[PDB]
Amino acid sequence: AKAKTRSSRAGLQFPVGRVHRLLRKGNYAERVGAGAPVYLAAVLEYLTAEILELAGNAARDNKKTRIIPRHLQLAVRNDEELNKLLGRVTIAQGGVLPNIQSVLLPK
Amino acid sequence: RHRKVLRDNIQGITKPAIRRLARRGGVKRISGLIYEETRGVLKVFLENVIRDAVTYTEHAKRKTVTAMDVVYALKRQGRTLYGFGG
Amino acid sequence: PIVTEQPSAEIREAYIENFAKGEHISAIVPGQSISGTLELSAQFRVPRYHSKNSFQQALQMKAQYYRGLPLYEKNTLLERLKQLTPNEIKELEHLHDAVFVNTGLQNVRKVRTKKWKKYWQYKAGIPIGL
């Protein structure tokens, strides 16, 4: 019947039947066990909350209510486990964290 | 009724083993600061594989270790090695 | 062989000389004590007077001292254990375990008092046993 999206059944924003549709689409298995899309959309919303947390943190730390990729750089690259997990992910218009080498500092 | 659990054979891996491998790795005067500076860092290598590899075992519903999941983990880490099937 | 401190009288001082700074050291140092381990449950257990199925089959059919107990004669105890019921076997097991643990605590308590009486003399300048 209607598109009554399966995220509301899971308390989610990410429609778990779009996720089940994508898992049937992604050739991961023949049967897509119907909790695997909920596991996916659930880890998805957990990490969406994880990063939107630090994103709004760094954005209002720069006194802006608009979260920008520079804020994404300064929030993500300050993290141990995130930047340890994302050592090879680059953020365009993220730039650098402000930091100088220690002996290049004049005395 | 005997519990066989081992711990830190990395000193049973001798410091003469470092005086071997440092020459195999091209070191002349291995200072005393080096020999155990080695023995920690490789142990960082050691658990991290099996931390995933034991993770292979239980979803596989097993109580043994194969080199199959060693290969799963090493290739999973980008440590591709031949001699083992594939 | 009556204490369990660090017997080297130069590592205990170097431990405090760095402890006031707030630094660890190489060797270890425990607090002083006496030796001896009070190891229970690797010792006398609750005995197994029941069989592997002597309770569920009883459920279907609707049923001088060695350590702390004196050794009974062969004929007198046999008619006594021809009297009891498997409602009281679980009582008897725990009664005999309560005797065994009490004796195994009494003798170790006596040895422990004999050790502490020599600890307090040693830590007060008396040599021993005076």
Binding site: - | - | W120, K123, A124, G125
Partner: protein
Amino acid sequence: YRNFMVNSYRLNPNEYFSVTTARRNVSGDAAALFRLHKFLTKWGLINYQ
């Protein structure tokens, strides 16, 4: 508590019988044991030599 502190000082009078060992060896709140130890060392009787 008082007999414990006085008996424990007089085994080795060259040692300052601290509050922390008295707190670690008898069961009670630290405030009352601290006040009793400071009263006791106020009148001699412990840590006098």
